[PDB]
Amino acid sequence: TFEIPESVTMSPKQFEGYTPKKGDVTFNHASHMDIACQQCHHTVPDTYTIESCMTEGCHDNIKERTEISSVYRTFHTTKDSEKSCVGCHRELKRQGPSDAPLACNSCHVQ
Amino acid sequence: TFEIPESVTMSPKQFEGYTPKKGDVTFNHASHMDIACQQCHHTVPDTYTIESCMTEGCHDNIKERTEISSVYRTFHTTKDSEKSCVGCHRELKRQGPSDAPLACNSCHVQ
Ligand code: HEM
Ligand code: HEM
Ligand code: HEM
Ligand code: HEM
Ligand code: HEM
Ligand code: HEM
Ligand code: HEM
Ligand code: HEM
């Protein structure tokens, strides 16, 4: 019965007491379909559910930036190539010509 | 919001006009958690849902046995080591000592 959402618009406006500096990000599963679900959704064994990365207790820290709980580190770190957006996209380029976006405005759009 | 069922009791009693020869099978995700979800649930790209293997149109053929749609071939074939139950369990033994069940009554229980 479980249905997967193809497109997902990730947003910083989720955090009430904060002012977003960049635009929203649209994530598409289709282009990432070859990667194991649990590779990105790495906490499935912990809760037996698939949930937002920015859930309370996970990567919901918007005030600090260097912390593992930080929204910034999590999606832009190159120290992780499995589940970090830019982290993986950068790693693909070392493996050969890749179009996986690195430019800020190629990810942050609307 | 998506919740995964740890234990799943697969049964042949689903097919009304049929008499099961073996007992039900209990599948546990915990012991299989290291395998990519889409490896077993191989039709996710097709429907963007995770559904029963024995759904109408999939592996629901109980009358024929050699067919890809056959409940028997699907779960006991050794010609596939990715998503066939005995197929993978057998392959593990070639990779080193394994306890993944091959005996009929180690899978069919209640
Ligand atoms: C594998 C085919 C796979 C599944 C299954 C899956 C599910 C899934 C769901 C159900 C959502 C919505 C979760 C919710 O209830 O909020 C969701 C969202 C995102 N996913 Fe996913 N996902 C699968 C695979 C992948 C892969 C390989 C990645 C990483 C490249 C990935 C990532 C994400 C992201 C990011 C989201 C948005 C999360 C958010 O905070 O809004 N998924 N996925
Ligand atoms: C959503 C698909 C999601 C992403 C993306 C994501 C990424 C991520 C990274 C980059 C790390 C850093 C690892 C490192 O520094 O090497 C990481 C680590 C942890 N995460 Fe995560 N994470 C996503 C989702 C979730 C969810 C829903 C939670 C909360 C249940 C969560 C938690 C954590 C924790 C804790 C860590 C560090 C310890 C660990 O278990 O690895 N993540 N995540
Ligand atoms: C992190 C949650 C994340 C986001 C966001 C993201 C976005 C993204 C975009 C915008 C594209 C372009 C196409 C599209 O919009 O669908 C794209 C493409 C690829 N990505 Fe990605 N991506 C995120 C995470 C990850 C992770 C962690 C990996 C690697 C394990 C990954 C990989 C890829 C690949 C492969 C592509 C295909 C591009 C191609 O050249 O065909 N992404 N991603
Ligand atoms: C380019 C170096 C770049 C910048 C700068 C940038 C900024 C940024 C900020 C500050 C946030 C926090 C929220 C805000 O609006 O201020 C944020 C969050 C996310 N980003 Fe980003 N981002 C840049 C580049 C990229 C690239 C190339 C991707 C996609 C691979 C990407 C993805 C994300 C995601 C996902 C988030 C979290 C959800 C959100 O707040 O939109 N960023 N980024
Ligand atoms: C990866 C962490 C993963 C997810 C996600 C997943 C989901 C899932 C669901 C939601 C069900 C119930 C489906 C329904 O609505 O009927 C389910 C059932 C089974 N799964 Fe699964 N599953 C994940 C991973 C794995 C892996 C790696 C395997 C293969 C070893 C696997 C297999 C199965 C089987 C068999 C069932 C029962 C199907 C039936 O016909 O009743 N899952 N899974
Ligand atoms: C449920 C998790 C499930 C299992 C288990 C499963 C196994 C399986 C095998 C062993 C094959 C044979 C491949 C070969 O001969 O090399 C196979 C092939 C197909 N399947 Fe399947 N399958 C499971 C689930 C599903 C579901 C829910 C459907 C129906 C949407 C489905 C369909 C098919 C089809 C069609 C094939 C052959 C062609 C192909 O796309 O690979 N399966 N499956
Ligand atoms: C096919 C849907 C399938 C079933 C059914 C199944 C059952 C099964 C059992 C009964 C065990 C024993 C433990 C338990 O009951 O949870 C077990 C263990 C392992 N399995 Fe399995 N298994 C099915 C499918 C698959 C597939 C397709 C693979 C390989 C890609 C696989 C692998 C394993 C592994 C690994 C174990 C761990 C045993 C160990 O020595 O620790 N199974 N499976
Ligand atoms: C041992 C060689 C063995 C036999 C024999 C056996 C039989 C069998 C039949 C005939 C079915 C159809 C339904 C019925 O009750 O008659 C069936 C279906 C499944 N089996 Fe099986 N099975 C044997 C062994 C194994 C092993 C080792 C596993 C687990 C790795 C296994 C799994 C399954 C699954 C799953 C099904 C489908 C769901 C069901 O009908 O119970 N079998 N098997």
Residue with tokens 């990432």: A32
Q: What is the DSSP letter of B93?
A: H
- Residue B36's H or E segment, with its range, is none
What is the CATH class of A1-110?
Answer: alpha beta
- What was the experiment behind these coordinates? X-ray
Distance CA A47, CA A49 (A): 5
Interacting residues of B58 by C-beta distance below 8 A, sequence separation 6+: B43, B51, B52, B69
Longest dimension (CA), chain A: 42
Q: For residue A29, which residues of chain B lie inside 8 Å, CB to CB?
A: 48
- Chain B, window 23-42: residues with a beta carbon less than 8 angstroms from a chain A beta carbon: 29-30, 33, 36-39
Resolution of the experimental model in angstroms, please?
2.2
DSSP string, A59-101: S-B-S-SSSTTBHHHHHH-SS-SSS-HHHHHHHHHHTS-----
Q: In chain B, what are the domain boundaries?
A: 1-110
Identify any residues that bridge with B1 across adjacent strands, giving them in sequence order: none
What sign results for the dihedral spanned by CA atoms B54, B76, B15, B2?
Answer: negative
The closest-lying atom of ligand 2 relative to the alpha carbon of residue A46 is 30
